[PDB]
Amino acid sequence: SVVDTVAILKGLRDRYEAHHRINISDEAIEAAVKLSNRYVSDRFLPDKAIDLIDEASSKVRLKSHTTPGMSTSLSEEDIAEVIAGWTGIP
Amino acid sequence: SVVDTVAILKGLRDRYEAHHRINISDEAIEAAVKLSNRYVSDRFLPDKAIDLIDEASSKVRLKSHTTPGMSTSLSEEDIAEVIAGWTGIP
Amino acid sequence: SVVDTVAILKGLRDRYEAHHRINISDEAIEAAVKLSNRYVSDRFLPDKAIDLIDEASSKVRLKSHTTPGMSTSLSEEDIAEVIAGWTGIP
Amino acid sequence: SVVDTVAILKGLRDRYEAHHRINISDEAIEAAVKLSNRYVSDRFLPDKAIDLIDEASSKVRLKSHTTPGMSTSLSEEDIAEVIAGWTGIP
Amino acid sequence: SVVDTVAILKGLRDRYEAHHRINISDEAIEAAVKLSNRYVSDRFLPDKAIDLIDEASSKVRLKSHTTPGMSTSLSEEDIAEVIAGWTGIP
Amino acid sequence: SVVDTVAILKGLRDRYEAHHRINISDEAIEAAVKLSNRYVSDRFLPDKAIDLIDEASSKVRLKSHTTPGMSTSLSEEDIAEVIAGWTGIP
Amino acid sequence: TLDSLARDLTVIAKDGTLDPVIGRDKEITRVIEVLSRRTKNNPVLIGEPGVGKTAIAEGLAQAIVNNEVPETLKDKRVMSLDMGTVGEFEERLKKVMEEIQQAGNVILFIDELHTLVGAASNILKPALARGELQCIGATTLDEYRKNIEKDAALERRFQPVQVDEP
Amino acid sequence: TLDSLARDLTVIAKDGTLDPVIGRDKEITRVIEVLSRRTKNNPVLIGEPGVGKTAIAEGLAQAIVNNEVPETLKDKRVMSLDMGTVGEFEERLKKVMEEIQQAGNVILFIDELHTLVGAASNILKPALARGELQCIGATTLDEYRKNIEKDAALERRFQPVQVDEP
Amino acid sequence: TLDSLARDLTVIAKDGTLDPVIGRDKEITRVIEVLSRRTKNNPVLIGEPGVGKTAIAEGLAQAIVNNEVPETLKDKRVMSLDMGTVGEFEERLKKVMEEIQQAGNVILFIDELHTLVGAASNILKPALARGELQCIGATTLDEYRKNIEKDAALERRFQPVQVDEP
Amino acid sequence: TLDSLARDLTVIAKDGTLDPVIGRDKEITRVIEVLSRRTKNNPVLIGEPGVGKTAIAEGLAQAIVNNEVPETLKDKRVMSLDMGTVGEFEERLKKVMEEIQQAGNVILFIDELHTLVGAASNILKPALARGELQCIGATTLDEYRKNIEKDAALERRFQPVQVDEP
Amino acid sequence: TLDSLARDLTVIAKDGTLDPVIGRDKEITRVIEVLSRRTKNNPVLIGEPGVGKTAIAEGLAQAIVNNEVPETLKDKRVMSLDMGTVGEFEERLKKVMEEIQQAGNVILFIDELHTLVGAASNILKPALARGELQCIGATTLDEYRKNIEKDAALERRFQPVQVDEP
Amino acid sequence: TLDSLARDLTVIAKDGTLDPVIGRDKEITRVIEVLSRRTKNNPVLIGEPGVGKTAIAEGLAQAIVNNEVPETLKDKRVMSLDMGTVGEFEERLKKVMEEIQQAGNVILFIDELHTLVGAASNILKPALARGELQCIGATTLDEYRKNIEKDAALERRFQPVQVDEP
């Protein structure tokens, strides 16, 4: 289920942020969970969320990684932008 | 024959209970014997009973193994539940 | 040919009876020869007779081997029973 | 051609008779040549004749080899019998 | 893009001329870039330009290599001739 | 080109005649050159001429090799016959 | 020996090397209870790849080191397959099997490709079919249609289970 | 020698190491009487695995140590196969055969996989086909369709028998 | 050497180890006369398995030790194949061939599966095709359709013969 | 060892042996970031051949020796495949893999034909599928349709990327 | 060396070991004249097996020892293939080729199966395709459809000829 | 070293060992100018076999020893391949490549079969693909369709050229 995913994502919530040195905002977390499930056929929200997440976690870090201070991951753009980067029409 | 099976099961009756530390109740024993023969195509009551049995012997032990006092194996659930766990509509 | 078989069986007539300690009765011998040829598709009367034979030679010995005095092999049952044991409707 | 075969058979005419110690009668020789060509699909009259021949040359020798005086090979039976031994309805 | 190609060609501009001992004229360079893209389906302007180029760089060198003084590569013929050598109707 | 071939054949003119002990007549040489090019698709006049040639050079030698005095190779037959031997309607 | 390809995450779980799972408990309860069977201790899984299934595996292993594993298996231990290759190849993979059968103390999880291979076919599959050596497979049916099934005695060896996306 | 893979349960039965069987008596009577044959002493079994068949085997061995075995075989003794492997492998398995053929006093039961193998094919199968060395096989037909049959001379070596679930 | 797989029943026939045949005499007369051929000494048989054919073989061997065999072959002796297997396998089977070719004194009967194999194809089949080494095959056509035929030069090596049930 | 087929252009880039690329930076940023993945470090490329892609590769290697490569990979180094062949062939290619896996310090780029071969199939592909050994492939989809895809677990191993003509 | 598989019937013909042929003279005249060709000295035959073709071959060899062979070939001599087999196999068959190419004095006739093989394909076929080593093949087209043809350069190496039953 | 298979005709041309060519001059001018390329020094030829192409090669070599070769290549020298074979085979052929790469002074012409082989594939083809070692191939397209093309990076390595019958 989308929700359990969030929990299992909450499971890895610390994981890749402690890899990516960021602060996950569950708002985002639930967001893509819906959104990916909505927009992504192939991989699975058990992952593809985290996919987006880590990728978002990257994109932030990317910006945060180098020249764009927020360490946390936004809800929206983290989902949105990336997801828009995934597809479009944010 | 279903019945000889019971005997041959009675043969292994001590066996896996002395493995599984339980008390086999022939009621169950004959039960699945019919029941498996009824409900199970593939493996053979010479085994599949014991299959159920040991599995039942597990399921009890499972409950009995850890947190659910009866060491004996019930007739019904041992057959039933497990068999329902096998299929349904107990 | 069925008949030559009998001869070739007569060839092994002493053979497996001296293995099976019995007395072959050519009545049987010709019997299955027809009968097997009649009733058995797969193996060949050059053998399958002897098959029956030795098997009959067993079945007798079996009875004769252990608890069922005739050392000879009957015509009929040796064919028949076994052949009925092969199929039915003696 | 059937005829050249005879010649090429005439070629080996001395050959296997000097192997089989017999006297080839070209009557036979031409005979099977037709006859084999008639009756034998598989091997080739360049051989199969000689096949028959040598085999006939055997069959005679066979008879001539052991207990059945003619050392020569007949036309007919040499063809015929053997060829009938090949097929039937001499 | 055709243009980036020119740059990446400008990247190898020194390269094969320092192999082919010639002077690349960007006029040519942009020329084929359009022209090849126009006229050549198969290989890719990232190369096929340089293909033409080096080949042009050859053709010049060829002439320049042996009996036909310009060390530089013309715009036109370097493209044109070769490209006409590629196709026609210069 | 057919003609250069003749020259390159003239190149090997001494060659296989000094192998085949014959005298090549350029009449033939040019002949097949046309003729083979006319009549032979597969191998190439750079060879197939010489093919014919050497083969002609054989055919002559063949005749000349054994019982059929001309050591030279004719124009025509050397081409023709062989070429007719190649095809027909000399 | 029992190393290289032979590895286990149970201690790693007792080492806390991995992630506490959720929700596949009763799912695992099945997967667990598969071992109970004199017939087939050996489950296989169907479902969607990458979803936590090998952690679902680890879920067992946790519940193992948790001793949420009941009796018989409590001594036994996970083995997480290692896949790789190196003259022959599989004989190694063939070899390890007695070793772990010699181990009297473990279990292996076969992972995903349970393979119809060129160089293959029955590899351990008889020693599988030996009716010994508790092990676990998994895939999605798309593969499951073949190896376990095309034998059907490996079907008689394997117990299929699947779980939907949580 | 005649050890390691070479082992017997008969003494073990006289040792009482195993279970008194039931009901396959006349079934065994056949399996027994298979040995009588100058043609094929060597039976193979079909049926459902794990049902008691190798004990059905032992059933013979009991009836052997019971001397329910009649004459010729009474001297002969069970051998229960051991399967395992270790450079080459089978040559051992090849080797033991003369040993037991040298034994003049025993019988072996070949168990289940009578194998079409990669490394294989005819192994003892000629020495099988040697028309000597009383032995027994078993399987379910699904295998039986092949090795004994695809030769058919091993079919001419083997006598198939099957018994339903009791 | 010339042992293990290399074995003969001729002496065994002179030893009387086997059964006097009947009726395939002139049948054998053919099989016999096959050896006469500079072209193909080497017959193969078709027919129904288990019918006495390898004794029909022995029939030759009797008629051999009987010296019902005429001249050339009288020195030569049966070899009855042994089939079995053990690294590589066939090279042995490959090896023996020169040995018996070295024997200058024998003949082998190849028995039934004359095989299209995985590990195979041309094995002796060239040394067969060497146009030497008098040997005999047999099968039923169902196989005969392939190996001897799919070459056809082994057909050119083999002479097929069949006999009905007596 | 780690030579012959094993070679690297990174030092060569530090040696300046090759061409500064342009424009595939963020393209490479992806290709780069592929390595980040515990799931798939291993990208493959689609696109038009001969366009600079293996220099795009080198682009990484530059950005590597540039240390435009971020942390984890900075120690790791390009390997540019060498393709060639020589008894067996691939075992070498099979062999090198542990070596580089032993290297604890590098990465290889597999180049174009990632091959469905006669002599083949799974070669490293398991050791690929071993879930180790960061590597990169490339092709155009026309091939991509098969090997990575027909498994789909190599799809689960590979990350496809493509870039248009600049 | 040039022995074992290497053998010749020419001397044997001068030895009179074989049969004077008839009628394929001008047929042979072709087969003969095939050698004349710088392009293809190497004929192959189609027709019906067992008809005298390898004697038709010998027919050449007679006409050779007859010196009905004209010049160039008169020094050259028949070789009649030997087919058989024995680790590797063909390398021998591969080996002999330089030997006879070293012979500066002979010719071989390849006989019937010119083979598409498992273990094969190009064997001498390049050294065939080397454009050297006058040799002769034969078959019936049914095979001819493949090896010589499926290359077509061996078609470019081979000259097909066929003759009806006389 | 640089001998056996390594050989050159240039000196032989300066030795006058061979034939002054005609007419392929500007044809060679291309073939020549192929070497100029940082991209592909390495041409391959299409056309009709046996027509003078390897002399067309020599034509270069003449024009080389003629110093009709312009600058860069003037130091470099022909190598005419030698084809033959002898445990492994190709490793030799593999080996020579560094030697000539070590030579700092030459060029090789690969001749005709540029081969898709059983024992093969990438042999030097990576060291080819190494982007070093000026060399030349030739064939007719019928082959050209495959090896250079089926890679297409060897197409990216090779430059095809063809010339009609003069």
UniProtKB/TrEMBL annotation, chains A, B, C, D, E, F:
Family: Belongs to the ClpA/ClpB family. ClpC subfamily.
Protein name: ATP-dependent Clp protease ATP-binding subunit ClpC
Residues of the full protein shown: 343 to 487 of 818
